[PDB]
Amino acid sequence: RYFDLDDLENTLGSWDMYGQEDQKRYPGLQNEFFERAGESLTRREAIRSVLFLGGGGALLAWGAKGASDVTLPITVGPQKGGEKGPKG
Amino acid sequence: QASLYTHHQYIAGFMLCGAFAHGAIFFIRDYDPVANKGNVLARILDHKEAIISHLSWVSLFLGFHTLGLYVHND
Amino acid sequence: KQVIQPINGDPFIGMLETPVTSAPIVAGFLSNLPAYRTGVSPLLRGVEIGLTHGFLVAGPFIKLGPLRDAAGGAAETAGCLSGALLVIILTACLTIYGQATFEDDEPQIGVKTLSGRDIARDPLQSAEGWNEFTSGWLVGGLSGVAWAYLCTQFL
Amino acid sequence: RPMWYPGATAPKHLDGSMLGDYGYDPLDLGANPDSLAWFREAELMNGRYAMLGVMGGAFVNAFGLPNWWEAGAKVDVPISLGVLIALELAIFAVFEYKRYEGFKKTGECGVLSFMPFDPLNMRSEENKLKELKNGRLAMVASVGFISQYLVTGKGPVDNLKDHIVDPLHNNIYTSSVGNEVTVAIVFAAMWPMFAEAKKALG
Amino acid sequence: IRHRDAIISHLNWVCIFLGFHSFGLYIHNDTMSALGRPQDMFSDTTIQLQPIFAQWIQSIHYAAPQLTAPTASAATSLTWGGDIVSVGGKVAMMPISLGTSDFMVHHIHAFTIHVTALILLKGVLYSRSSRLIPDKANLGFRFPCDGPGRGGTCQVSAWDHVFLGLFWMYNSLSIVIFHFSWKMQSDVWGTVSESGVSHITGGNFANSANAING
Amino acid sequence: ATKFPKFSQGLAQDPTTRRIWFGVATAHDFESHDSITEETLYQKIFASHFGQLSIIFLWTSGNLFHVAWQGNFEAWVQDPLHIRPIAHAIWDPHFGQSAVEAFTRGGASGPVNIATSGVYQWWYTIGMRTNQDLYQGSVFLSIAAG
Amino acid sequence: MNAAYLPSIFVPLVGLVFPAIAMASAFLYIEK
Amino acid sequence: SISESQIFIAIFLALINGFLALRLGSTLYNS
Amino acid sequence: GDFLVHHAIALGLHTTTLILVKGALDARGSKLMPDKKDFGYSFPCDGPGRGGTCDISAWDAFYLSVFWMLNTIGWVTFYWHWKHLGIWQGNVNQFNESSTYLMGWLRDYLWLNSSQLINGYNPFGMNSLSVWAWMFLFGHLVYATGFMFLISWRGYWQELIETLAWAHERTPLANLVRWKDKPVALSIVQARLVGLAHFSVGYIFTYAAFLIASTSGKFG
Amino acid sequence: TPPQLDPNTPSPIFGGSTGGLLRKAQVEEFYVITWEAKKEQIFEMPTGGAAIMRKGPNLLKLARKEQCLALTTQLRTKFKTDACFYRVFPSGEVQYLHPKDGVYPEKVNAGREGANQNMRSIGENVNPIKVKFTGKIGPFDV
Amino acid sequence: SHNVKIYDTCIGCTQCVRACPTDVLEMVPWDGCKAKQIASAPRTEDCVGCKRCETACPTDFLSVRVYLGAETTRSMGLAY
Numbered sequence A: 001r002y003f004d005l006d007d008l009e010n011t012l013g014s015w016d017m018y019g020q021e022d023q024k025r026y027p028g029l030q031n032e033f034f035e036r037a038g039e040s041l042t043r044r045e046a047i048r049s050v051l052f053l054g055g056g057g058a059l060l061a062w063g064a065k066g067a068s069d070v071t072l073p074i075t076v077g078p079q080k081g082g083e084k085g086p087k088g
Numbered sequence B: 001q002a003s004l005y006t007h008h009q010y011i012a013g014f015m016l017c018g019a020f021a022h023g024a025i026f027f028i029r030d031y032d033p034v035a036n037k038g039n040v041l042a043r044i045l046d047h048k049e050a051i052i053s054h055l056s057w058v059s060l061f062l063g064f065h066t067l068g069l070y071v072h073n074d
Numbered sequence C: 001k002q003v004i005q006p007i008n009g010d011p012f013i014g015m016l017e018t019p020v021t022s023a024p025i026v027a028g029f030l031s032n033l034p035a036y037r038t039g040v041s042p043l044l045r046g047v048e049i050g051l052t053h054g055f056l057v058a059g060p061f062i063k064l065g066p067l068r069d070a071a072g073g074a075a076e077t078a079g080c081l082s083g084a085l086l087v088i089i090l091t092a093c094l095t096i097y098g099q100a101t102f103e104d105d106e107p108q109i110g111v112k113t114l115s116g117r118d119i120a121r122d123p124l125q126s127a128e129g130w131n132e133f134t135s136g137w138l139v140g141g142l143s144g145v146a147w148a149y150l151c152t153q154f155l
Numbered sequence D: 001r002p003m004w005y006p007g008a009t010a011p012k013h014l015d016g017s018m019l020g021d022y023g024y025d026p027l028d029l030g031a032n033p034d035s036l037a038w039f040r041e042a043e044l045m046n047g048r049y050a051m052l053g054v055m056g057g058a059f060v061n062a063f064g065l066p067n068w069w070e071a072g073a074k075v076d077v078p079i080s081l082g083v084l085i086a087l088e089l090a091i092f093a094v095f096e097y098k099r100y101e102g103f104k105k106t107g108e109c110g111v112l113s114f115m116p117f118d119p120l121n122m123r124s125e126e127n128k129l130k131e132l133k134n135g136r137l138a139m140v141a142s143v144g145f146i147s148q149y150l151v152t153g154k155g156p157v158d159n160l161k162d163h164i165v166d167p168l169h170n171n172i173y174t175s176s177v178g179n180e181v182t183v184a185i186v187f188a189a190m191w192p193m194f195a196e197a198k199k200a201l202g
Numbered sequence E: 001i002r003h004r005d006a007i008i009s010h011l012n013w014v015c016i017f018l019g020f021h022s023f024g025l026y027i028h029n030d031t032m033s034a035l036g037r038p039q040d041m042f043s044d045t046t047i048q049l050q051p052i053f054a055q056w057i058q059s060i061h062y063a064a065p066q067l068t069a070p071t072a073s074a075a076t077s078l079t080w081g082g083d084i085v086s087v088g089g090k091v092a093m094m095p096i097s098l099g100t101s102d103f104m105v106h107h108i109h110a111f112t113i114h115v116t117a118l119i120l121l122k123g124v125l126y127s128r129s130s131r132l133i134p135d136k137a138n139l140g141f142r143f144p145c146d147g148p149g150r151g152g153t154c155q156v157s158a159w160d161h162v163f164l165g166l167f168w169m170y171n172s173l174s175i176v177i178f179h180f181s182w183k184m185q186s187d188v189w190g191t192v193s194e195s196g197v198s199h200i201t202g203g204n205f206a207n208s209a210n211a212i213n214g
Numbered sequence F: 001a002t003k004f005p006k007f008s009q010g011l012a013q014d015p016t017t018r019r020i021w022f023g024v025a026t027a028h029d030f031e032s033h034d035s036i037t038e039e040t041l042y043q044k045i046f047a048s049h050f051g052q053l054s055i056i057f058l059w060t061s062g063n064l065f066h067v068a069w070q071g072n073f074e075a076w077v078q079d080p081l082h083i084r085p086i087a088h089a090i091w092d093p094h095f096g097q098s099a100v101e102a103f104t105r106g107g108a109s110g111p112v113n114i115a116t117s118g119v120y121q122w123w124y125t126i127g128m129r130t131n132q133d134l135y136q137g138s139v140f141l142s143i144a145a146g
Numbered sequence G: 001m002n003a004a005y006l007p008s009i010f011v012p013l014v015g016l017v018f019p020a021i022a023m024a025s026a027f028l029y030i031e032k
Numbered sequence H: 001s002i003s004e005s006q007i008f009i010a011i012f013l014a015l016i017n018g019f020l021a022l023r024l025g026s027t028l029y030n031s
Numbered sequence I: 001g002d003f004l005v006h007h008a009i010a011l012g013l014h015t016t017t018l019i020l021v022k023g024a025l026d027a028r029g030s031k032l033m034p035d036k037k038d039f040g041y042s043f044p045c046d047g048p049g050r051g052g053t054c055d056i057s058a059w060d061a062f063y064l065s066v067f068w069m070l071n072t073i074g075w076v077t078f079y080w081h082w083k084h085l086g087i088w089q090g091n092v093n094q095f096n097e098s099s100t101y102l103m104g105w106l107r108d109y110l111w112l113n114s115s116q117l118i119n120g121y122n123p124f125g126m127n128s129l130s131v132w133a134w135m136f137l138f139g140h141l142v143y144a145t146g147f148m149f150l151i152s153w154r155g156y157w158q159e160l161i162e163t164l165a166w167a168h169e170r171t172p173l174a175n176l177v178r179w180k181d182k183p184v185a186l187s188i189v190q191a192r193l194v195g196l197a198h199f200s201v202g203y204i205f206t207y208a209a210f211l212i213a214s215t216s217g218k219f220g
Numbered sequence J: 001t002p003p004q005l006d007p008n009t010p011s012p013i014f015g016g017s018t019g020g021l022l023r024k025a026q027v028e029e030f031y032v033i034t035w036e037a038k039k040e041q042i043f044e045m046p047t048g049g050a051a052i053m054r055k056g057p058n059l060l061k062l063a064r065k066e067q068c069l070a071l072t073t074q075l076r077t078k079f080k081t082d083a084c085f086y087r088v089f090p091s092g093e094v095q096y097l098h099p100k101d102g103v104y105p106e107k108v109n110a111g112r113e114g115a116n117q118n119m120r121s122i123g124e125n126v127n128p129i130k131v132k133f134t135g136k137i138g139p140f141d142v
Numbered sequence K: 001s002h003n004v005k006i007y008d009t010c011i012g013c014t015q016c017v018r019a020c021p022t023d024v025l026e027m028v029p030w031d032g033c034k035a036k037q038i039a040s041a042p043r044t045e046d047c048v049g050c051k052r053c054e055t056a057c058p059t060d061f062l063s064v065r066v067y068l069g070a071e072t073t074r075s076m077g078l079a080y
């Protein structure tokens, strides 16, 4: 027998298992520096898009620019002699 | 040539298999037996089996005998 | 006696408690993690959680990357840069999961503790609590790879 | 409401409320999914810091000729690497930390109430468009000074005199991207009609 | 029957685990070949993945007829660290060496043997009734779908998990053989050539087959 | 209808992912939507043909443009039998020194695909004989499709 | 060919960037 | 041998064929 | 050899039509289920009643045609290729001799052509056909994937997802991250459609690689 | 007469199993069974495993109406007891499902006014043209 | 929600109503029948689509024909 139908919260076993009560266990010495470093980007579509538009541009940038390419047909690549078929 | 001749055979295959599908979507939806009573479309539906049965003979004839010869030759 | 029981009374709930579910150790450990606590800001978790996952992800790249031979330490930065991408990619994923599940208007859907007590729902549910976490993840995620590099060229 | 002469309709997002508004919002960015007037400062700070930009590269061709692209190259000042950058790092952030963190908290007028920097404030806020308007114009020339080096390479004024000497033969339309621009000019002539045919023909 | 959702779930994870690790490592080896970068493909010259334990086992048994097997003529069999044996100019049995390509295969044996356990166990535990079909027992051992409803029940019965198990049995064992047959031709069989002991395939396995390439 | 399959409310409300799968595959069927009158059914169709018809032209302008740019033409025009027609170059970030070289077969510098499409002769038997002609021609189909 | 630096600019943009954006935006539109 | 100048002209010309589709696909889906 | 093949070709055209001509005429109805006019066009079945209807619809009828379409075209494109190969290679005797019995098709046309293709990825080095050597494998793996959808039907997978949506749901650290759209084993018809896509995509890429890289390897 | 509320009837003895409620129950409806007992004995549980029913009126919580009638067909045809069940969902209100008329549907009662009937034989249905672009779910509606 | 509709042909055998695992079909009394009884489907909500109905109809061509509609939380029979 269980019931307490007045509460459907305890009938579902939905209880959060490993969630604790304890408040912040973290030091104020390092608190006040990060807590103000996170909200510089708080916003939905004007920031996530910065990651797509501005963030993914290093594929563009250092894919073309920096000469660290390894065996890339981009840059170093073909430098050796080209293969010719039997017929032509 | 090879890369072509095969292209236009396959791309011709799919198009016919779609010619019959929309042939079915026709009959399943926008065909009307009333206004078509006695037409040429209704005469075909009047004998379904004859068409179905004879294609079933020709496809079996070629089935046994064409395979039956390759196996005999093997 | 019998060691194994259904979770906390009712047998008809899906899971049932076992030594890796309800124990002295496992109850405490999984609860100590910067995950389940209800008493710390979500911004502070991302700067914790993401801070770790940058360091350990660098390793595979900075060790077994495409280019594992360089005389300038470039084999190490080639992994740092790419390991810094899964930092930048997952930020897109994290933030995306916020605009989907959580509506700014809808309240926190988290449930209430383990036993008898209803304690204030997970401060991270809605987009506000979530987005503060995402930027937090991005703050730490950059550090983890960074200190991984510093630990590569030093220490 | 001159409003860049598309014809009549501007989107509602730009009505002429904010200063300088000609109601041009092609990409629907002038909307407010987060804010808009944040763009105004972003325009303005760009604009402000831009309009003062030309002055450095402008006059240097006219005087001693270490022109801007070659300017930051040759000097004796920078002292053993980091001292060259490291000094310039702090002083901006420390005051920008104030105005950036402050004026998205202390109110949305970027250094307008001017509490950090007190001007003579004789003219003050009415003509403020004119500031914004005079810099936006210098913004566009600033792009040119790039291509002045890229396409030609001569100094901005050394390009001017060539246009003064031979007005017909110094155009972009001859050199390089001339073939490219003259197409972007054509496709910009029909541009107002396509935008207008939405309204009229719809 | 009561915790069954735990058993099946974990086994279902073990397969996906081996799916990418066991099999996928060939796809790496396949691809890194075709891109002209042999330095990468897991192999003997390249990245070493060797069956430590299995190799280490063969060490004991060739050291066995010393102390752990004091009364013997010699070790039990020659697949351990023994020496070659000939008859009629043929190799009776020589030893077998376990290299990287031997490593990668056993995990494919493991991959198939797990996946085919998933299917049969799931057939037993969900034979009675599953979470989606509570009556399933009353429909018999062998039945087609219940409905087209519920997105369709097609092939839910416990006769039908044996249907599926036979394609994984077939697959599992078939590769058990191709491992055998061409390991045994590579590293054992063939005529005794005196010098060279040339095998049937000339001893190409650990080099020959790493990727699905070969 | 709010959610993704805007055109059918039976899919529009589904808790599962079948809303997603059918939403893609039920799209182009215009006889089934919320309310599709006889008139507005012909509309989207006749608009769609402009889609297919424009997509084709760009696809052709690509073939022309690439052969005009990344491929050899003049060199082939001189020796149709003894040299291979080339298609777009092979850009992969993923190669070794060998596979780059081994694919540079052709007249060009980089790795390229010998083109088995066959389009390359139908230009010459119509006749062009400059990369300019191909580019000149590859612009129209870009324009015309517009 | 004279344009040679283009593929390095486009292919990453069209093989990754566009599939990154069209992965995000097409997702956010599945649920509204 | 194609002049580098022509190339960007074409790419910009095909850039317009990208917007006219976006303008179409909107108006068609907007219906 | 020319004679015997044209009957296979002729066979393939009939059994393809036989399927499609059936699906059209039985779209309206047949003796088993004469509701199909009003039951929709593409529907999974009428349920396991009165003999267990399956593939009873007219979409499932079309569905079966593709598998024959890919033969009767496969037979053609084969028979076209290897009559020409001999003619490009200067000999009419490879075909009309060995074309009669089915082993030459396997023993001569398939065995000789495969030697050049498989040497692309060869551990000794990359040939210029290494492009096609890989894809020819990509062609099978898709074809082989296609059987997982065609053979294994839904109810098995729907009980499997149940176990996973239970595990992800009650596992720690993944409690916090959940799905909006409840995952479900995809629909009956949806699989066959997905199944026949893999079957074809795999059926094409192998023969597209074999054909090109046989005539690119030899050059007729 | 027919409807009833939810008094306190205990739950049958069982030791827990992975079959049972899930995170539907939090946001979504779930069912409840109430029957009675005479002797105590064991019954198949449809969510898996076996459970001991008490000596008297009992109450269960299942996850599906489907699972629910599996257990009524169980006890009605085997131990020959009646059962009736409910629909409970988190907003707090409960509905009475199952013989809403007070009689099992298998047997006739009066007062039932049935829906979804057609007065035509099947062959007498409309063919899909005659509902075209006007629209209905199918030829059977019209 | 699935659609289920019933026809003149019913013998009133109840053999449908015994089949439905969700107890949709419910026997409504009637007149013209031999046994003077007709089924009916008050809940189209909970028809899962099993078509265990259509198997049970002793009638030559069915008295019930289930027409599958869209599929909800219930009509998918989800425990998730």
Ligand SMILES: CCCCCCCCCCCCCCCCCC(=O)OC[C@H](CO[C@@H]1O[C@H](CO[C@H]2O[C@H](CO)[C@H](O)[C@H](O)[C@H]2O)[C@H](O)[C@H](O)[C@H]1O)OC(=O)CCCCCCCCCCCCCCCCC
Pocket (backbone or CB within 6 Å): F008, F009, F010, F011, F021, F022, F024, F025, F026, F032, F033, I040, I041, I042, I189, I190, I191, I193, I194, I196, I197, I200, I201, I204, K069, K070
């Ligand atoms: C061309 C692709 C583009 C280029 C390639 C891009 C990569 C492709 C990535 C795949 C992207 C699409 C994936 C689709 C998967 C979903 C398929 C599905 O579940 O789709 C199944 C749908 C489900 O059917 C529809 O299902 C509907 C479901 O009902 C819905 O619709 C009803 C109708 O109103 C109501 O709205 C109701 O509320 C709602 O439930 C209805 O039943 C419709 O009547 C019924 O038609 O079926 C259909 O309609 C069938 C329509 C498909 C017919 C075409 C099949 C051809 C087979 C391919 C041929 C082989 C090709 C190989 C090529 C190899 C060479 C390269």
Ligand code: CLA
Pocket (backbone or CB within 6 Å): B014, B015, B016, B017, B018, B019, B021, B025, F024, F025, F026, F027, F028, F029, F030, I041, I042, I059, I062, I193, I197, I201
């Ligand atoms: C110009 C030709 C043409 C036109 C206009 C149509 C138009 C139509 N057809 Mg149709 N069809 C055609 C040709 C055509 N078809 C051909 C050639 C075939 C045979 C293959 C078919 C077979 C067919 C069937 C079987 C069905 C239709 C249906 C439909 C209708 C809806 C289509 C739909 O929902 O697609 C929406 C878009 C999709 C479903 C895209 C799915 C992608 C497919 C599966 C291909 C995936 C493979 C891919 C290419 C692989 C990529 C390879 C790469 C990864 C390497 C619509 C009226 C359906 C209908 O009306 O039902 C009521 C239907 O059931 N057609």
Ligand code: CLA
Pocket (backbone or CB within 6 Å): B056, B059, B060, B062, B063, B064, B067, I011, I015, I018, I019, I064, I065, I067, I068
């Ligand atoms: C190689 C495989 C294969 C073969 C041989 C067939 C054969 C056939 N299919 Mg089929 N089919 C196949 C694959 C195959 N299919 C696949 C993969 C699909 C996709 C699902 C289909 C889909 C399909 C459809 C949809 C249809 C067919 C049809 C047919 C028949 C066409 C007529 C014909 O050629 O008869 C030739 C018959 C044979 C060659 C049988 C050979 C057996 C010998 C002659 C007798 C037995 C030998 C020996 C005595 C056995 C001893 C056993 C031992 C116990 C003593 C035929 C029975 C059509 C049909 O019904 O035709 C009427 C039809 O509608 N099939």
Ligand code: CLA
Pocket (backbone or CB within 6 Å): E012, E015, E016, E018, E019, E020, E023, E024, E027, E115, E118, E119, E164, E167, E168, I141, I144, I145, I146, I147, I148, I151, I152
């Ligand atoms: C070649 C065909 C093929 C393949 C690849 C599979 C694959 C699979 N089957 Mg299987 N199956 C097949 C045929 C096949 N089947 C057939 C013909 C049948 C008929 C009997 C079945 C019947 C069957 C059953 C009954 C079961 C499976 C199961 C499985 C899964 C085991 C887990 C696993 O290995 O995942 C790992 C994935 C791989 C090994 C695929 C390799 C691909 C590479 C490594 C990853 C690609 C990287 C990246 C994502 C590339 C994409 C990027 C791109 C989008 C840009 C797996 C998805 C079992 C399952 O799901 O439970 C575990 C299961 O119960 N199948």
Ligand code: CLA
Pocket (backbone or CB within 6 Å): E031, E034, E035, F088, F089, F090, F091, F092, F093, F094, F099, F113, G011, G014, G015, G018, G019, G020, G022, G023, I130, I131, I132, I134
């Ligand atoms: C790890 C394996 C791998 C990977 C990742 C790549 C990656 C690539 N190869 Mg490649 N290659 C490989 C192995 C690999 N290769 C091997 C082993 C060989 C043999 C030696 C080659 C030979 C080779 C050649 C010869 C060429 C490439 C090319 C390419 C590039 C094509 C990219 C592109 O245009 O995307 C676009 C990709 C597609 C359009 C096809 C995918 C279809 C998608 C996935 C279906 C989805 C459709 C649906 C509507 C969803 C829409 C998606 C949405 C995001 C828009 C890309 C960089 C090409 C290149 O560099 O220039 C183009 C080229 O010509 N490769």
Ligand code: CLA
Pocket (backbone or CB within 6 Å): F058, F059, F060, F061, F062, F063, F065, F070, F088, F089, F090, F091, F142, G006, G007, G008, G010, G011, G014, H010, H011, H012, H014, H015
């Ligand atoms: C549909 C035709 C088509 C196809 C299949 C390709 C295929 C390819 N092009 Mg391409 N191209 C085309 C037309 C086409 N081109 C046209 C008309 C132009 C003139 C602007 C170009 C200009 C161009 C350049 C400058 C380059 C390529 C390159 C490439 C290769 C890598 C993919 C890439 O970077 O594309 C990127 C291409 C663009 C951004 C141009 C716009 C896209 C064109 C118009 C095709 C759009 C059709 C498509 C269905 C649109 C749907 C998009 C979305 C809804 C899915 C690949 C072989 C690269 C290459 O050769 O490196 C090896 C490269 O550097 N293309």
Ligand code: CLA
Pocket (backbone or CB within 6 Å): A051, A052, A055, A056, A057, A058, A059, A062, A063, A068, A070, C065, C066, C077, C078, C079, C081, C082, C085, C088, C089, F093, F094, G011, G012, G014, G015, G016, G017, G020
């Ligand atoms: C057009 C498609 C495309 C392109 C351009 C690339 C490009 C690359 N791949 Mg890749 N890949 C692709 C498709 C593609 N891939 C697909 C489809 C698969 C799955 C089948 C893979 C699987 C794969 C693997 C498994 C690996 C690669 C690797 C690589 C890198 C080659 C090795 C190297 O020099 O790294 C050296 C790289 C650097 C020195 C720096 C790169 C960092 C850039 C400049 C920063 C990017 C910024 C941006 C935030 C990135 C996120 C994008 C997103 C946010 C929009 C190169 C960046 C290797 C790699 O990443 O290792 C490093 C590697 O191990 N690929």
Ligand SMILES: CC1=CCCC(C)(C)[C@H]1/C=C/C(C)=C/C=C/C(C)=C/C=C/C=C(C)/C=C/C=C(C)/C=C/C1=C(C)CCCC1(C)C
Pocket (backbone or CB within 6 Å): B019, B020, B022, B023, B024, B026, B027, I024
């Ligand atoms: C099933 C379906 C749904 C409902 C309506 C719909 C009509 C679509 C119906 C039909 C669908 C389809 C695709 C039906 C037919 C398809 C096919 C295979 C059509 C092919 C017909 C072939 C024909 C004539 C050939 C006729 C004769 C020819 C060339 C030869 C002529 C000649 C000979 C033999 C020697 C040379 C000189 C000369 C005199 C010209």
Ligand SMILES: CC1=C(C/C=C(\C)CCC[C@H](C)CCC[C@H](C)CCCC(C)C)C(=O)c2ccccc2C1=O
Pocket (backbone or CB within 6 Å): I148, I149, I150, I152, I153, I154, I155, I157, I184, I185, I186, I187, I188, I191, I192
């Ligand atoms: C494997 C399998 C599944 C499980 C397969 C699933 C759930 C597909 C999902 C796999 C991942 C999540 C997606 C695969 C990645 C694709 C590349 C996605 C393509 C996306 C485009 C369509 C846009 C079924 O649901 C099924 C149903 C009926 C008959 C046979 C089968 C069957 O064989």
Ligand code: SF4
Pocket (backbone or CB within 6 Å): E144, E145, E146, E147, E148, E152, E153, E154, E155, I044, I045, I046, I047, I048, I052, I053, I054, I055, I153, I188
């Ligand atoms: S498989 Fe699909 S069709 Fe064949 S019985 Fe099961 S449900 Fe009916």
Ligand code: SF4
Pocket (backbone or CB within 6 Å): K009, K010, K011, K012, K013, K014, K015, K016, K017, K038, K039, K056, K057, K058, K059, K062, K063, K064
């Ligand atoms: S429907 Fe079929 S079974 Fe149900 S009562 Fe009428 S006749 Fe008897």
Ligand code: SF4
Pocket (backbone or CB within 6 Å): E149, K002, K004, K019, K020, K021, K022, K023, K024, K025, K046, K047, K048, K049, K050, K051, K052, K053, K054, K066
């Ligand atoms: S199909 Fe719908 S109606 Fe027929 S039995 Fe199953 S649930 Fe009751």
